Automatic annotation (TrEMBL), chains A, B:
It comes from the Bacteria. TPR repeats lie at residues 53-86. The chain holds residues 27 to 128 of 128 of the full protein. It comes from Thermotoga maritima (strain ATCC 43589 / DSM 3109 / JCM 10099 / NBRC 100826 / MSB8). This is Uncharacterized protein. Keywords: Membrane, TPR repeat, Transmembrane, Transmembrane helix. The keyword Membrane applies.
Length: 106, 106
């Protein structure tokens, strides 16, 4: 040609580097906000969502353990909505039901 | 005319993408080895080893809280060996012992 016409490719790649940098150097929320708004497909995203969902379950569990069932419920539902990972689903669903039991006075 | 420097940039960015992927999803040693081999200049390189140790502690702790003690053991031992920080090693050691108690049936 000898034009390579790489600009579109490189600007996508720049954004995916920026996404990885947000994951490494910033909060999960900053990372996912950027990925969502730039519409990026990040390889291994599911693993990252699973890890964050697991962190949310842990937060809920600590709230559950202080009998803040209402607040705990919020975290389990968040975890459920964040990751479609099968273990996350089962564990979050378990704890969600435990909250519901306590909330019903059972 | 064409801009071959953008193609060079492409090669650099592909490598940098792979580096970040190794950092996030693989062991620090693999990331280190790849960066050295490719002579990449990663921004914040000197920060990453301790950051990795910390993320391993966090991920290990969330596995611990979801009662995956066998899985968590791996994260804690890796963090124990990767960190150069005595406080971080105390955290890792504490959880490692708890995981071992779980493997033993307490």
């Amino acid at each position: 040609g000898s034009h390579m016409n790489l600009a579109v490719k490189l600007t996508r790649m720049e954004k995916t580097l920026k996404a990885y940098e947000l994951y490494i150097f910033s909060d999960y929320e900053n990372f996912e906000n950027y990925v969502k708004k730039e519409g990026l497909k990040i390889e291994g995203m599911e693993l990252l969502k699973e890890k964050k969902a697991r962190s949310l379950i842990a937060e809920g569990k600590d709230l559950f353990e202080t009998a803040n069932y209402g607040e705990a419920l919020v975290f389990f539902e968040k975890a459920l909505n964040l990751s479609d990972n099968e273990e996350i689903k089962k564990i979050a669903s378990f704890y969600l039901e435990e909250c519901r039991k306590k909330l019903a006075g059972d």
